[PDB]
Design a protein around this nucleic acid. Structure first.
Ligand code: SF4
Ligand code: NA
Length: 213
DNA sequence: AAGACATGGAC
DNA sequence: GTCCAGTCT
């Protein structure tokens, strides 16, 4: 694992590589964001943005989602992988927003996690992007980057990774650092072919030096 | 607690 | 024809 100063050094670099890093899921409100991120699990944004382009046209409130037949909703998001579980989760989720949260998307992370289909990653994206609540959502990219760079150990769980970053990164920068890491991993330290040769971190990166050598 | 969920894009 | 883009029971 790198030293704290090194980690901050890696993050400060990513910041310069992707100064405009942001959430790339198209949404007009917290609710649209919630649905968008739920469909985003194990799927690409381009795909999700395409589907919600029409979905948010057909649905605009939770009453709209539970109004139609489950089979209908499934069809509406059929191109999304894991669409069956997602379609079902959305209906139970909307029902709960109505029954339990006065028909609104809760601003609490743990409260969001009670919603069917919502795990820690999803809840973290939502409170951060929609309500400015500092949080570090750990997805495939964040985890890969953290491990390749030696931010934490390869055996650490997503929670452990999240706790490592929170301990290092100042609460006031958790959100933006999260997006920078996403961008860094999505457009640079990719899973299939990382751009190590021209990376400003190879000089202190374990995965990068092994990749070259 | 591994296992099932699952379409679509990048090679 | 593989590999990659979280949650639940
Ligand atoms: S050196 Fe390679 S593996 Fe390390 S962070 Fe840069 S691109 Fe990722
Ligand atoms: Na949940």
């Amino acid at each position: 694992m790198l030293t704290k100063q090194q980690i901050r050094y890696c993050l400060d670099e990513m910041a310069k590589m992707f100064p405009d890093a942001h959430c790339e899921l198209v949404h007009r409100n917290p609710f649209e964001l919630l649905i968008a991120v739920v469909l985003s699990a194990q799927c690409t944004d381009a795909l999700v943005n395409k589907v919600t382009k029409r979905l948010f046209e057909k649905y605009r409130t939770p009453h709209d989602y539970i109004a139609v037949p489950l089979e209908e909703l499934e069809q509406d998001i059929r191109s999304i992988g894991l669409y069956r579980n997602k379609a079902r989760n959305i209906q139970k989720l909307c029902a709960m927003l109505i029954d339990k949260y006065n028909g609104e998307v809760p601003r609490d992370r743990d409260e969001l996690m009670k919603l069917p289909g919502v795990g820690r990653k999803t809840a973290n994206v939502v409170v951060s992007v929609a309500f400015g609540v500092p949080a570090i959502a750990v997805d495939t990219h964040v985890e890969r980057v953290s491990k390749r760079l030696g931010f934490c150990r390869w055996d650490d769980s997503v929670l452990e990774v999240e706790k490592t970053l929170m301990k290092i990164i100042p609460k006031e920068e958790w959100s933006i650092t999260h997006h920078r890491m996403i961008f860094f991993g999505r457009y640079h330290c990719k899973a299939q072919s990382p751009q190590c040769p021209s990376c400003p971190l190879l000089h202190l990166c374990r995965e990068g030096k092994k990749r070259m050598r």
